[PDB]
Amino acid sequence: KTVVVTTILESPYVMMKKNHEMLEGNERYEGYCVDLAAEIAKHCGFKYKLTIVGDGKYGARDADTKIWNGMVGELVYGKADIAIAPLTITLVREEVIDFSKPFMSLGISIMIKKPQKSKPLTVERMVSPIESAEDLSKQTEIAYGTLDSGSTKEFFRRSKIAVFDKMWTYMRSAEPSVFVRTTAEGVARVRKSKGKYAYLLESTMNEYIEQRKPCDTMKVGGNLDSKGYGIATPKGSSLGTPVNLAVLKLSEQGVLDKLKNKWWYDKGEC
């Protein structure tokens, strides 16, 4: 029996190959997550089929409707067996699905358009109007937002820290809406907003986008928190312990480090 591996289209985790029109099956996709699935299969023998989540969402719970959407919803309602995707381990998600040990460490970072070089002996220096989350919250000329139906938005919603609470209070009543539907949409907003929009995304995606052309964006400050990506399985499933053991084996063998190096830094430019 073949199990369903749900995932989301997000570079560099899951990207379509250039010649993907003539290919079929799992060979159309490429990235970190497809290699992770291949290594998981190598550890524990099973047949898997790569599928993309229908709504293109990571997962969230509506307050009034109380139905999980995205990959978490797909896993909860039995439409998938395992989610090998950049899914953030959160307390609310852990109560409805099973998470393995983290395979990648990350944190919430800020993305802004890279400032032009300041000419004024004849040294060149780069100065950005945002240096930390606190000054980003204090100012009001640059709008900021997160990804809709994501872990960062829920983190800001349920944060009792004064700075993060202030940012959330600004976000919930910002006209026009500062929330985006996709990471690429947020990066496009940052690029075309001429320095008047800051995107709050994970540090891994931020660094990856900064490492590729045209590299007109930069990451400012440090990470707002420390989290991780976990492989998710439904509650009471027989694939949880083998997946956790496989992740631990890959971590000890150094496969994860080599995968990160070959998918993030060996493919950068500029």
Helix, strand, or coil here: 104?
strand
Q: How far is the CB of 237 from ligand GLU (least distance, A)?
A: 19
Query: Closest separation between CB of residue 120 and a second copy, Å?
Result: 26
Binding status of residue 260 toward ligand CYZ by CB under 6 A: yes
Which residue bears the tokens 């909860």?
A: 76
Q: Which is nearer to ligand CYZ, 28 or 101 (CB)?
A: 101
> 25: exposed, middle or buried (C-beta count within 10 Å: 0-12, 13-18, 19+)?
exposed
Among 140, 176, 177, 214, binds a second copy (CB under 8 A): 140
Cβ atoms of 4 and 49 within 8 Å: the answer is yes
Does 157 help bind a second copy (rule: CB under 8 A)?
Answer: no
**Backbone interruptions in the chain following residues (C to N > 2.5 Å):** 120
Return the structure tokens found at 2.
């073949």
**167 with 136: CB under 8 angstroms?**
yes
Our finding on whether 226 is near ligand CYZ (CB under 6 A) is yes
88 labeled binding residue? yes
Q: In what order do the strands lie in the sheet with 82-83?
A: 47-52, 2-7, 82-83, 232-234, 97-99
- In the bound state with ligand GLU, the residue whose beta carbon lies nearer, of 43 and 88, is 88
Which H helix or E strand runs over 185?
helix 183-192
Residues 73-132 that bind ligand CYZ (CB under 6 A): 89, 101-105
Selected range binding ligand CYZ among 116-124, 141-149, 178-186, 220-228, rule: CB under 6 A: 220-228
Give yes or no for residue 224 binding ligand CYZ (CB under 6 A).
no
Could you say which of 1, 117, 160, 194 contacts a second copy (CB under 8 A)? 160
Distance, CA of 183 to CA of 188 (rounded, Å): 9
What does 41-77 look like in DSSP terms, one character per residue? Answer: HHHS--EEEEEE-SS----EE-TTT--EEHHHHHHHT
122 assigned to a ligand binding site: no
Interacting residues toward ligand GLU by CB under 6 A: 58, 86-88, 146-147, 150-152, 201-202
Q: Should residue 249 be labelled a site residue for a second copy when binding is judged by CB under 8 A?
A: yes
Q: Minimum distance from CB of 155 to a second copy (Å)?
A: 7
| Tokens describing residue 17 | 């190959």
Residues making up the binding site for L-glutamate: 86, 88, 93, 151-152, 202
Contact positions vs ligand CYZ (CB under 6 A): 89, 101-105, 226-228, 248, 251, 256-257, 260
